[PDB]
């Protein structure tokens, strides 16, 4: 089950079945090995590569909406990485999965989200949209991300289906960043607008060790290889 | 079944329940209601937000692969589209997911692809990765993308495949533009290098017509709204 880390944040309790394989298989990365400046980036590929772990989160909240009531009327999944989550659970609840996108990737009339101002060296805020009308009055929206870090798109997930007339389930990620403090953030911004948003995680980055690492030890060769340079190590 | 439309390429035979399902399901947009400058961008969120169709399309597949000798090993999607449908085949085979990324989105020890010079004015090409030993000798990996328009990164998909010491089952979509001749392409650069290469598809986007446009008829205001502006057309 869920426990209340925090005022509407729950984490799934370590001793779930699912909670154990995600600390099993997710493997983090440090700079020189990762594409993003932070500490130690979770790879989404390191869940989606492990068909025990995919399908253990599949059955897990696939169970959990079919429980729920009332029951989601669609999935709305981040560009990209909660691409790979959303659809296999949509599929079985036979409900919409609708993406968020940057306008640019997105296709028809859209809405866009208002991102708040940046805050001195703090990373630039993305404007994400979904086609106008994908989700209409009424709709109980589940949002899907991997990881809930600073939750800048959490926010535009909000806004849009706010916007859209219709109500946000729960935002959903795999893995949580309790460091830096997104549901507290969302839950207070705007006089505690956000506040009745629910924020569920089936992990915390503090359930990862250094046993989680999948940096190459001893290694000092460039993070990137030509196809060119890598058929040249072996008889081809 | 997939019939042979041209050398290794093949089609699903339009009587199909799920060709059928596909060509009722698809709605296209020209330019002005669309993020890409192509006469009709096919809108893979007419596809993932159908229930029916979704499944459709991962009963099929996973079918397909099941009855399979000797069977894929792996399942390899591209960003973003192809993490669509990957993820949900994948669980169902119990088999790996691994992510085609640009570099700056993927994570470990990274093998880049080598595309071709463009022709002018064609598109640039993208430079597309897979993290260094995600697929291993022996491999048998089958490719997935929405629409296989030019076929540049399915390229990037064989380099991929080839360099990591691994074979391809075949490069797979939902939807196929002929017209592009990615597949003709494909199978004779290089000397006809591959020409083995499979291609299966399982709609034309010949089967789209002006029935499946989703551009909205008379009207002239601009493609995107912010959600201030979608708020203010209902009581809130
Ligand atoms: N995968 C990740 N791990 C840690 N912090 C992140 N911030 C954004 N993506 C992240
Ligand atoms: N969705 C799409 N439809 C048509 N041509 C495309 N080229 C790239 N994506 C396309
Ligand atoms: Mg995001
Ligand atoms: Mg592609």
């Not at 503090?206 to 060769?221: H, I, P, V």
């Amino acid at each position: 089950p869920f426990k209340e880390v925090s005022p509407n944040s729950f984490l799934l309790d370590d001793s779930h079945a699912l909670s154990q394989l995600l600390k099993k298989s997710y493997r983090w990365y440090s700079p020189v090995f990762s594409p993003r400046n932070v500490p130690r980036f979770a790879d989404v590929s390191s869940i989606t590569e492990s068909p025990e772990t995919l399908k253990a989160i599949r059955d897990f909240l696939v169970q959990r909406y079919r429980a729920m009531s009332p029951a989601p009327t669609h999935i709305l999944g981040f560009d990209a990485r909660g691409f790979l989550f959303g659809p296999m659970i949509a599929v079985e609840l036979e409900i919409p999965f609708v993406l968020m996108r940057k306008a640019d990737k997105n296709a028809g009339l859209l809405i866009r989200s208002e991102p708040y101002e940046k805050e001195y060296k703090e990373a630039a805020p993305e404007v994400m949209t979904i086609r106008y009308g994908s989700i209409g009055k009424g709709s109980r929206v589940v949002l899907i991300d991997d990881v809930l870090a600073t939750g800048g798109t959490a926010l535009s997930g909000l806004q849009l289906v706010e916007a859209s007339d219709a109500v946000v389930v729960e935002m959903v990620s795999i893995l949580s960043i309790p460091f830096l403090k997104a549901a507290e953030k969302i839950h207070s911004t705007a006089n505690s607008r956000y506040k009745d948003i629910k924020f569920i995680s089936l992990l915390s980055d503090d359930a990862l060790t250094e046993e989680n690492c999948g940096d190459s030890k001893n290694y000092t060769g460039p993070r990137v290889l030509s196809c060119g340079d890598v058929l040249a190590e072996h008889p081809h």
